[PDB]
A and B are shown apart, each in its own frame.
Chain A
Amino acid sequence: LAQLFLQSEAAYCCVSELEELGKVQFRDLNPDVNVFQRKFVNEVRRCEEMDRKLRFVEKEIRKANIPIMDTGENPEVPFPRDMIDLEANFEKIENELKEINTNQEALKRNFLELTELKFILFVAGVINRERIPTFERMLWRVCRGNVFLRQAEIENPLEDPVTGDYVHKSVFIIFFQGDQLKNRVKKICEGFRASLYPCPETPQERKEMASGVNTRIDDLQMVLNQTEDHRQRVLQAAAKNIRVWFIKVRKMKAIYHTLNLCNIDVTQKCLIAEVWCPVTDLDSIQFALRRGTEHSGSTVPSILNRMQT
């Protein structure tokens, strides 16, 4: 057991270099002090937020089958203060991605919703013919089939939005002139597994509206396709930087956590710590310390002196 005193600016760099060397184990000089008391909490908290957010995006990356090879850059683990802004930049990217997917899902609903109308043009809606055998009978139960039903069958039906998958669709829906019974049918249609919300017209104008719908559908799909394309390009590009980032962030966290396990002096911006280290490797440690503090602009001697124990 030996004790080292050096300036805190030099200390950040030195700890980083020693962590890269990996031959020294630091002891906690303040065992009765919690993380808020150690005052690395803001740095750790930021690291933890960065980590979780990175992992969040990582899940999307992995689902997207991005190679994330993690073969370089990361090993150098630089730890400038500007990394905090880089952390924020990460948060922005994943947040953008989160908005895009949310938008896509809404777009998907609209796509499907318009697609159903496209198909329709009561109503020739989208039904799996789950309860239609009973829908008709329920109608007969409310009134004796006062109006004929419209029948249709969809070849290669569209993927039902609630289902999330593609099922054959078949429609048999009744229209009524009576208001009491129309309201009754409304209630049945709401209760039964049927697609009902068509806004029919018989005028040529409605066929023209249906054409406008097709146009809008195409525009929606175009925008969707571009959104997804951007998403994927961004995800893979981020996957490259994320493999590097993961380890960079982990290293920073480890460094700050190690520095918490220390006793910060009160009167000077200098840090004293006791560490265990191999005797034979002490020279190697001092050379690492020299390089670390040399990177630090203050070039504090950073002398590690053996204690008796």
Chain B
Amino acid sequence: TEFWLISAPGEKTCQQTWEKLHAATTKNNNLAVSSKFNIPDLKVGTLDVLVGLSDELAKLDAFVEGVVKKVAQYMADVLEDSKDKVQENLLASGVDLVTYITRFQWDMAKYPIKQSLKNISEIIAKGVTQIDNDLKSRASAYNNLKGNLQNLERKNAGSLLTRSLAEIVKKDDFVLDSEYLVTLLVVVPKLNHNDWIKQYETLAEMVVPRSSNVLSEDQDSYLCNVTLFKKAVDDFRHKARENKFIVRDFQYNEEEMRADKEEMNRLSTDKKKQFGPLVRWLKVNFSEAFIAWIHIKALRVFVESVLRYGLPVNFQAMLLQPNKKSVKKLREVLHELYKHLDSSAAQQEYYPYVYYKIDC
């Protein structure tokens, strides 16, 4: 979604229509969509200040463009009102970007027209700077939450060989409050499930026969609990390993499992609670970033137009919505229409008129 922003010297009033309405001469013979660009009438002093401003604005432009695209990607990562294949951008001014740009207005609320450009630029720069820091910090904190939540999901992921037992083991799975006995959980591949049941009773001296049962099963193995004499556990786990059974390092612990369950429940709720305010925060920041973005471009237009054509500052600036495969024709038309003013001052960027691209 690319739009072209241009400005003509405006010597004659026909320029208002030549850039829009003159089907005989206008864009793709009046096939490209164009609209009026609303610009404030601001004060200029000497040409060197304008030169400074041009440099400053080019830098501010690049900065904000980066910031607004970054935050757009942040929301893409959030997956709310903007995706990479659909919903390519967010609303600006409460309208879609296509609508915003097409009916783009100067935000005099933020940039009073009675101020000098230096101050206007400084004000915008400060706004977008604050927005950048606010959302960078917020996004980082959110990403850290997402990180920890995924970390817990992974911790509670996997098969019985590695999966956390918080959701598997019950108090009724362990032999508790025994003086001599401990209950161990061992994973026996399902192919050898009966062998475990047959073999566990004879793996070590002084084990409790017929005590073996199954706590859980998965596609590869069964997790079984066995109660045994504490001192035989070394022989039990040793010989179990010899018969290719894997014992888990687990003992019943109500507090750790409860803590894990609530921590996951809390982090998921926290994710939802931040999401709520996340999308409102980021969408507002986007809106403002996009508004400022175009404001910056408008100022770049003002500065270049005045710098090249002099004052009074009456120029005919217009927006185009290029049509597919007509870029060449539009450039040829614009060149023939305006080449006589510069002949050589303005490939990669230099045209005989004020020209910027909008990358959407």
Is chain B in direct contact with chain A in the complex (CB below 8 A)? yes
Q: Give A contacts to B, CB under 8 Å.
A: 137, 140-146, 177-181, 184
The reply on B307 being an interface residue by CB < 8 A is yes
Q: How far is the CA of A261 from the CA of B47 in the complex (A)?
A: 85
Across the interface, do B308 and A144 meet the contact criterion of CB distance under 8 Å? yes
Q: How far is the CA of A144 from the CA of B310 in the complex (A)?
A: 9
Q: Which residues of B contact A141 (CB under 8 A)?
A: 345-346, 350
Across the interface, do B308 and A137 meet the contact criterion of CB distance under 8 Å? no
Shortest beta-carbon distance from B40 to chain A in Å:
22
Q: A141-B350, A143-B307, A144-B308 are in contact. Are A181 and B345 (CB under 8 A)?
A: no
| Residue among B51, B307, B309 making CB contact with A184, cutoff 8 Å | B51
The reply on B52 being an interface residue by CB < 8 A is yes
Q: How far is the CA of A75 from the CA of B347 in the complex (A)?
A: 78
Q: Give B contacts to A, CB under 8 Å.
A: 46-49, 51-52, 55, 307-310, 342, 344-346, 350
Q: How far is the CA of A177 from the CA of B47 in the complex (A)?
A: 9
| Residue among B46, B47, B51, B344 making CB contact with A140, cutoff 8 Å | B344
Q: How far is the CA of A227 from the CA of B46 in the complex (A)?
A: 54
Closest 8 CB pairs of A and B: A178-B48, A140-B345, A180-B51, A180-B48, A144-B308, A178-B47, A137-B344, A179-B48
Q: A137-B345, A140-B345 are in contact. Are A146 and B350 (CB under 8 A)?
A: no
Q: Which residues of A contact B310 (CB under 8 A)?
A: 144
Across the interface, do B48 and A181 meet the contact criterion of CB distance under 8 Å? yes
Task: Taking A178-B47, A180-B49, A181-B51 as given, write out 4 further A-B residue pairs in contact, using a Cβ cutoff of 8 Å, ordered by the A residue number.
Answer: A143-B307, A145-B345, A180-B51, A181-B48
Shortest beta-carbon distance from B339 to chain A in Å:
14
Across the interface, do A140 and B342 meet the contact criterion of CB distance under 8 Å? yes
Q: How far is the CA of A145 from the CA of B48 in the complex (A)?
A: 13
Q: How far is the CA of A179 from the CA of B45 in the complex (A)?
A: 13
| Residue among B47, B52, B346 making CB contact with A146, cutoff 8 Å | B47
Across the interface, do B344 and A143 meet the contact criterion of CB distance under 8 Å? no
Which of B51, B55, B310, B344 has the most A CB atoms < 10 Å from its CB? B51
Across the interface, do B51 and A178 meet the contact criterion of CB distance under 8 Å? yes
Q: How far is the CA of A47 from the CA of B47 in the complex (A)?
A: 72
Across the interface, do A144 and B48 meet the contact criterion of CB distance under 8 Å? no
Q: Which residues of B contact A143 (CB under 8 A)?
A: 47, 51, 307
Q: Which residues of B contact A145 (CB under 8 A)?
A: 345
Q: How far is the CA of A143 from the CA of B52 in the complex (A)?
A: 12
Shortest beta-carbon distance from B129 to chain A in Å:
23
Question: Which of chain A's residues has its CB closest to B308's CB?
Answer: A144
A selection of 16 A-B contacts at a CB cut-off of 8 Å is: A137-B344, A137-B345, A140-B342, A140-B344, A143-B47, A143-B51, A143-B307, A144-B309, A144-B310, A144-B342, A144-B345, A146-B47, A177-B47, A180-B48, A180-B55, A181-B47
Question: Which of chain A's residues has its CB closest to B309's CB?
Answer: A144
Q: How far is the CA of A220 from the CA of B308 in the complex (A)?
A: 48
Across the interface, do A180 and B52 meet the contact criterion of CB distance under 8 Å? yes
Question: Which of chain A's residues has its CB closest to B53's CB?
Answer: A180
Q: How far is the CA of A27 from the CA of B49 in the complex (A)?
A: 90
Q: Which residues of A contact B345 (CB under 8 A)?
A: 137, 140-141, 144-145
Which of A137, A180, A181, A184 has the most B CB atoms < 10 Å from its CB? A180
Q: How far is the CA of A180 from the CA of B45 in the complex (A)?
A: 13
Q: How far is the CA of A178 from the CA of B47 in the complex (A)?
A: 6
Shortest beta-carbon distance from A179 to chain B in Å:
5
Q: Which residues of B contact A184 (CB under 8 A)?
A: 51
Shortest beta-carbon distance from A206 to chain B in Å:
26
Question: Which of chain A's residues has its CB closest to B48's CB?
Answer: A178
Q: Which residues of A contact B344 (CB under 8 A)?
A: 137, 140
Q: How far is the CA of A86 from the CA of B115 in the complex (A)?
A: 85
Shortest beta-carbon distance from B28 to chain A in Å:
29
Question: Which of chain B's residues has its CB closest to A147's CB?
Answer: B47
Question: Which of chain A's residues has its CB closest to B49's CB?
Answer: A180
Q: How far is the CA of A79 from the CA of B51 in the complex (A)?
A: 79
Which of B48, B344, B350 has the most A CB atoms < 10 Å from its CB? B48
Shortest beta-carbon distance from B310 to chain A in Å:
8
Which of B46, B47, B308, B350 has the most A CB atoms < 10 Å from its CB? B47
Q: How far is the CA of A190 from the CA of B336 in the complex (A)?
A: 35
Shortest beta-carbon distance from B71 to chain A in Å:
33
Shortest beta-carbon distance from B346 to chain A in Å:
7
Which of A144, A178, A181 has the most B CB atoms < 10 Å from its CB? A144
Across the interface, do B51 and A144 meet the contact criterion of CB distance under 8 Å? no
Q: How far is the CA of A27 from the CA of B220 in the complex (A)?
A: 98
Shortest beta-carbon distance from B169 to chain A in Å:
74
Q: How far is the CA of A142 from the CA of B342 in the complex (A)?
A: 13
Which of B49, B307, B345 has the most A CB atoms < 10 Å from its CB? B345
Q: How far is the CA of A144 from the CA of B354 in the complex (A)?
A: 12
Q: How far is the CA of A178 from the CA of B344 in the complex (A)?
A: 22
Q: Which residues of B contact A142 (CB under 8 A)?
A: 51
Q: Which residues of A contact B51 (CB under 8 A)?
A: 142-143, 178, 180-181, 184
Q: Which residues of A contact B46 (CB under 8 A)?
A: 178
Q: Which residues of B contact A140 (CB under 8 A)?
A: 342, 344-345
Q: How far is the CA of A184 from the CA of B46 in the complex (A)?
A: 16
Q: Which residues of A contact B47 (CB under 8 A)?
A: 143, 146, 177-178, 181
Q: How far is the CA of A180 from the CA of B48 in the complex (A)?
A: 5
Shortest beta-carbon distance from A301 to chain B in Å:
97
Q: How far is the CA of A181 from the CA of B307 in the complex (A)?
A: 11
Q: Which residues of A contact B55 (CB under 8 A)?
A: 180
Shortest beta-carbon distance from B31 to chain A in Å:
32
Q: How far is the CA of A143 from the CA of B310 in the complex (A)?
A: 11
Q: How far is the CA of A246 from the CA of B52 in the complex (A)?
A: 69
Q: Which residues of B contact A137 (CB under 8 A)?
A: 344-345
Q: Which residues of B contact A179 (CB under 8 A)?
A: 48
Q: Which residues of B contact A177 (CB under 8 A)?
A: 47
Question: Which of chain B's residues has its CB closest to A142's CB?
Answer: B51
Across the interface, do B52 and A144 meet the contact criterion of CB distance under 8 Å? no
Q: How far is the CA of A146 from the CA of B46 in the complex (A)?
A: 12
Q: Which residues of A contact B49 (CB under 8 A)?
A: 180
Q: Which residues of A contact B308 (CB under 8 A)?
A: 144
Shortest beta-carbon distance from A14 to chain B in Å:
86
